[PDB]
Amino acid sequence: GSTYVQALFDFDPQEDGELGFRRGDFIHVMDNSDPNWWKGACHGQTGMFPRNYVTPVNR
């Protein structure tokens, strides 16, 4: 379906093996796990990223 967002702000990793992207970077919501945190991907790599650091693309 549609599990993409648009990096609200820049997210610099903070966890060992966590995701890292830059505003406008469409995160690929592979599986929303935590409330304020989810699992997705972007730079040819998956990982976890703050769910509030992104935003939906469609509406």
Q: Give the CATH number of the domain where residue 59 resides.
A: 2.30.30.40
Experimentally, how was this structure solved? NMR
| Tally of structural domains, the chain | 1
Residue 57 Ramachandran class (φ > 0 left, ψ -120 to 50 alpha, else beta)? alpha
Contacts of 59 (CB under 8 A, 6+ apart): none
| Of the candidates 19, 14, 27, the residue with the CA atom closest to the CA atom of residue 54 | 27
Q: How far apart are CA 49 and CA 59, in angstroms?
A: 22
- Domain that residue 6 falls in: 1-59
Residue 47 Ramachandran class (φ > 0 left, ψ -120 to 50 alpha, else beta)? left
